[PDB]
Ligand binder design. Sequence first.
Ligand code: NAP
Ligand code: 4O9
Length: 316
Amino acid sequence: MASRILLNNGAKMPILGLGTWKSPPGQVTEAVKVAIDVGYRHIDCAHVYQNENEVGVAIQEKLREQVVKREELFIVSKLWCTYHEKGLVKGACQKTLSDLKLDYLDLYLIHWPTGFKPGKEFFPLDESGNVVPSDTNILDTWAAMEELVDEGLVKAIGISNFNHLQVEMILNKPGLKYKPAVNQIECHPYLTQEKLIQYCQSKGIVVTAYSPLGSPDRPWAKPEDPSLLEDPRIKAIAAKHNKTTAQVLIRFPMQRNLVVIPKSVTPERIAENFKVFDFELSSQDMTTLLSYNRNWRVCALLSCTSHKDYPFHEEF
Ligand SMILES: NC(=O)c1ccc[n+]([C@@H]2O[C@H](COP(=O)([O-])OP(=O)(O)OC[C@H]3O[C@@H](n4cnc5c(N)ncnc54)[C@H](OP(=O)(O)O)[C@@H]3O)[C@@H](O)[C@H]2O)c1
Ligand SMILES: O=C(O)COc1cc(Cl)ccc1C(=O)NCc1c(F)cc(I)cc1F
């Protein structure tokens, strides 16, 4: 299987990338350096992760060392919810570019479909704990994203955590100039996303699977939640293939024509997670993994559930 997938902007995107949410700022520079040294060419970032400066130090060092050329890297970031307004989008993108020490992003995503009140706080709340919306809509935010392409700041634009109706709304936008290249969504054997993936793929939108290992370090994990990495059924498939459970969990979305972005700051795991191009899951393995769906989400957030554009009320 090829290492990159063709996007609807004509550029190629590596199907395996390194995630950076929760990567501590004192560890992520080395994580990204190691990743690039062992073959990663795609890094998934976001302003809200609060570590783009440190990610950028690694990228810049590897560019300066001439380990890789800029054209060989595929750097992704995301516009946070408090920057959905027309007059804030460019500055938000530029702050990310400055922190990452880049002059363009390969892909810039609307992180969530919901706009929040601008200000210092990433999650502005009312006194009862509800997020405070902005009156921005996904269509006007999209137009602002299109401007970034036309200004040379980003090579591609896309969306993240958009449900099927929201994807449809973008595709049906009056005067749409650029289609979204990517929809980045949670996807793993407990949240298999058949409906939304089929819709996006049918429209030429590439899907990136986040939390492919079930995000065991998510800060709201409860001791009781289901655990992909410990599921004996998945362990059995891994054993059959002489691979680790994580390697199976990474290979799974790859064979569905998805991009996948496992996170690690552990050098041995960063390397392990990349060793997924020399084995194949059978069709029976794939269908068996799909059968584990339980509609379980890592990424949901009560404080945001009443926002008009919160994505997870719809079935898909
Ligand atoms: N667009 C969005 O809204 C959104 C939401 C969630 C995630 N994402 C992106 O997707 C990335 C991945 O998702 P995620 O961070 O939620 O979780 P994940 O990649 O599913 O899991 C990361 C966890 O798995 C551990 N791990 C990594 N490789 C392992 C291995 N080979 N064996 C055992 N454990 C391993 C990591 O530990 P160590 O790091 O300690 O090694 C970390 O605790 C994020 O970092 C972010 O870039 C985007
Ligand atoms: O959104 C991500 O990329 C990962 O999740 C988070 C990352 C940070 Cl730095 C802070 C918060 C979260 C988080 O709570 N994510 C879940 C979440 C939202 F942040 C925002 C919405 I709108 C819905 C939702 F489920």
